[PDB]
Amino acid sequence: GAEALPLYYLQITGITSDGNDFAWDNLTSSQTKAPNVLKGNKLYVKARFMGYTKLTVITGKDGKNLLYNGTAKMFKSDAILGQNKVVIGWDKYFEIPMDALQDNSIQIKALSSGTTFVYSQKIDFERE
Numbered sequence: 001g002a003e004a005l006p007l008y009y010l011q012i013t014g015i016t017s018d019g020n021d022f023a024w025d026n027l028t029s030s031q032t033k034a035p036n037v038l039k040g041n042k043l044y045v046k047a048r049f050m051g052y053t054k055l056t057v058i059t060g061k062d063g064k065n066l067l068y069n070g071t072a073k074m075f076k077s078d079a080i081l082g083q084n085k086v087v088i089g090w091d092k093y094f095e096i097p098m099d100a101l102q103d104n105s106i107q108i109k110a111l112s113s114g115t116t117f118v119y120s121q122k123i124d125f126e127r128e
Contacts, residue, residue, distance in 0.1 A: 003087045006113035007051035010120045012106065013091075014046035017098070019128070027123070037126030043096040047108055047120065048080075050089040055111035058094075061102040071097045098127060 012031070014024040019039025024046060027035070056074070060066040067073065073095050082088035096106060105124040112118050 004052040006116075007049055007053040007110050007118055008112065009048065009050035009089075010108060010110055010118040011048050012045055012108065012120055012123050013048040015106065015123060015125075016044045016046075018042035018044070030121070031123060032121055034123055034125035037128060038098070039128050041098045043098045043106060045094050045096065045106060045108065046091055047094070048089060049092050049110065051112070053110045053112070056092065056094075057109050057111075057117070058096065058107070059102070059109075060100050062100075066096070066100060067094075069100075071095070071100055098125075 013027055015027065015034065015038065016022050016024050017038040017040035020036070022044070025035035056067055058066040058072060060069065074092055075095055076093035078091050079087065080089050080091060104127060105122045107122050108120045109117050
């Protein structure tokens with residue numbers, strides 16, 4: 001246990017949709033709102049998880065884990081390096097429906113350690 005430290009940083013980091021030319025729009029370092037109105041319904045986050053997790057949660061409107069509900073899945077998992085080939089984290093991609101969300105924003109939360117659940121920010125957006 002050295003480079004499998006718990007999740008120490010969670011942030012939405014990039015966002016796009018299928019309708020937005022896959023324009024990943026590098027989010028400001030503490031952004032609270034969208035770059036633009038994301039066209040479409042296939043919402044694509046590219047969120048930075050610095051530290052080990054496989055316990056992602058997204059509560060949706062209904063108040064249940066959407067990634068165990070039906071629509072949202074992780075479907076792509078690259079790697080990231082902290083220069084010295086150190087595995088600082090992996091960019092866990094997700095396929096969220098905009099439609100199933102509680103409000104016009106996206107948010108992720110994940111298990112850091114014990115029962116700490118890092119909440120990402122909220123990123124409010126427009127629907128076409």
